[PDB]
């Protein structure tokens, strides 16, 4: 009991939370410094696999600075005894602020406009945007991140429509979201954003079938989970200009070794930014940090 | 104002409202430049876009002329200085293409709290830069409007629902206007050190020539990110280098140059930079909505 490894980049704060003491170092091989102290605390690079959780018998903590635990093998923790926590609160602002300048980006070309500019040319011809006012924006998966986006949309004039089998209706109409069959959704939006956690029925929910029922010219957003937009199915609707315009800041593989995706002249992408704020970083670090403190 | 000559294509409700306005109208396109002054011989008012150019022959044969309208705000294919000669009114339109700025505007402040833009051109380039492209969040930050009008409103009220406390001035709105569109206004001074973006939607003025300069710069919050979607010139070019050089401005989103395209590279090639086309009002809305405003001027006239 008592002894923490912070083995990622995290906020201060999340030492200056002490619990007892800390150690802290970075960019460890799977060699590391291997004598792990009673808990580890990581965001994303530290690889939490099986052999680690095995070679250090004495971690009874495995704790994340960020949502999910895609970094973690939740397997080999319950092998031996080991509770994994996480901070699914500590990024949600963030990830819908950065899904928010995404379609901004996707309506006005911004990204492409500045590779154009930089390129030393001036063409005002090319790049004929759209206006977001009385658009259709299409919310699916209505938690946390998808109602934030949502009220911060409905301030452009677009008109907020989604599903979730969890969140009512009613509740969604609470938050100007109006809930219509997944079905229903497709042929009226100008936009979509993902919001929906990683699940079977979920994995390519954009697909060549789903994006053949979307309006011709549709725009997608993917800033949550790497799969729920079918890359293969993606890229085939951008070729065929079914996808006028995509904006990725996860993949299905992390950094992307399939190039055709990113490399699209309709496409804009991020190398995971979603919870990368310092606000954000403050209080994955402060959230992780307390409950570990919390320990009685 | 009785004849107004619609010499390119638009939409056709602007003919529908002149002629609720009791105006006669002709409309014709591709006409060459004796054609154009002969149909004009009995027009007071002319309506343009782009192609047909309305230069100093076509305004000095056509003595009838009394209102050169045209399909946006800006400059292109009209002489101002032949229609400055023979007293002739220009007409734009600011409130047409307002929302598309004001979009534009909110896309910059978004793609530079995260550089967007940039993380893209990093992709494109097949590299995974995590640690590079640490951003900020919009969240309980200090946006200082410089211009409460039209386009200074509708950017506010999109980033209040981002959470982003709403500051500025304006010597033309009232306090009380402002205060509607919860815009707390404060003077000049007192708005630098606050600030942690600032944006600009003020025309273009000896008054506000220069208005971000070095002066300022220094005023301002080290870190501070401004925006430019109004005109070129508003921000000193050669004082937001500096700013930039320094570290004192985190990083710029320009639409527009004192020199359109620009000669001088340094700005547009900053990798802090973010940089448009003077597309602000390049949207397929507010160009199908531009010619419809026109014949509301035109008529608000008569
Ligand atoms: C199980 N599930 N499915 C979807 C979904 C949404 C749209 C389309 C398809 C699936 C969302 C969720 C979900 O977990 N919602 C939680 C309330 C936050
Ligand atoms: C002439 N003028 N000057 C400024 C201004 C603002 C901040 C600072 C300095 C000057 C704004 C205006 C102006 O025309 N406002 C109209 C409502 C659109």
């Not at 079938?209 to 085939?236: H, M, P, S, W, Y």
Request: glycine residues 10%.
């Amino acid at each position: 009991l008592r002894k923490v490894l912070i083995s990622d980049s995290l906020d201060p704060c999340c030492r200056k939370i002490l619990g007892l003491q800390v150690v802290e170092k970075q960019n460890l091989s799977k060699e590391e410094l291997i004598a792990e102290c009673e808990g580890l605390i990581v965001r994303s690079a530290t690889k939490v696999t099986a052999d680690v959780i095995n070679a250090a018998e004495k971690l009874q903590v495995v704790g994340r600075a960020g949502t999910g635990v895609d970094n973690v093998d939740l397997e080999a923790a319950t092998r031996k005894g080991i509770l994994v926590m996480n901070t699914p609160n500590g990024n949600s602002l963030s990830a819908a602020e950065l899904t928010c300048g995404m379609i901004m980006c996707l309506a006005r070309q911004i990204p492409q406009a500045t590779a154009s500019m930089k390129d030393g040319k001036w063409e005002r011809k090319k790049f004929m945007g759209t206006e977001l006012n009385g658009k259709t924006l299409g919310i699916l998966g209505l938690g946390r991140i998808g109602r934030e986006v949502a009220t911060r949309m409905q301030s452009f004039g677009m008109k907020t429509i989604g599903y979730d089998p969890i969140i009512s209706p009613e509740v969604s109409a609470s938050f100007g979201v109006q809930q219509l069959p997944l079905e229903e959704i497709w042929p009226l939006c100008d936009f979509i954003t993902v919001h929906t956690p990683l699940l079977p029925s979920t994995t390519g929910l954009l697909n060549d079938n789903t994006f053949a029922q979307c309006k011709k010219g549709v725009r997608v957003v993917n800033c949550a989970r790497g799969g729920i937009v079918d890359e293969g199915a993606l890229l085939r609707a951008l070729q065929s200009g079914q996808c006028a315009g995509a904006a990725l800041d996860v993949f299905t593989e992390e950094p992307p070794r399939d190039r055709a995706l990113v490399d699209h002249e309709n496409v804009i992408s991020c190398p995971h930014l979603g919870a990368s704020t310092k606000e954000a970083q403050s209080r994955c670090g402060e959230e992780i940090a307390v409950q570990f403190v919390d320990m009685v």
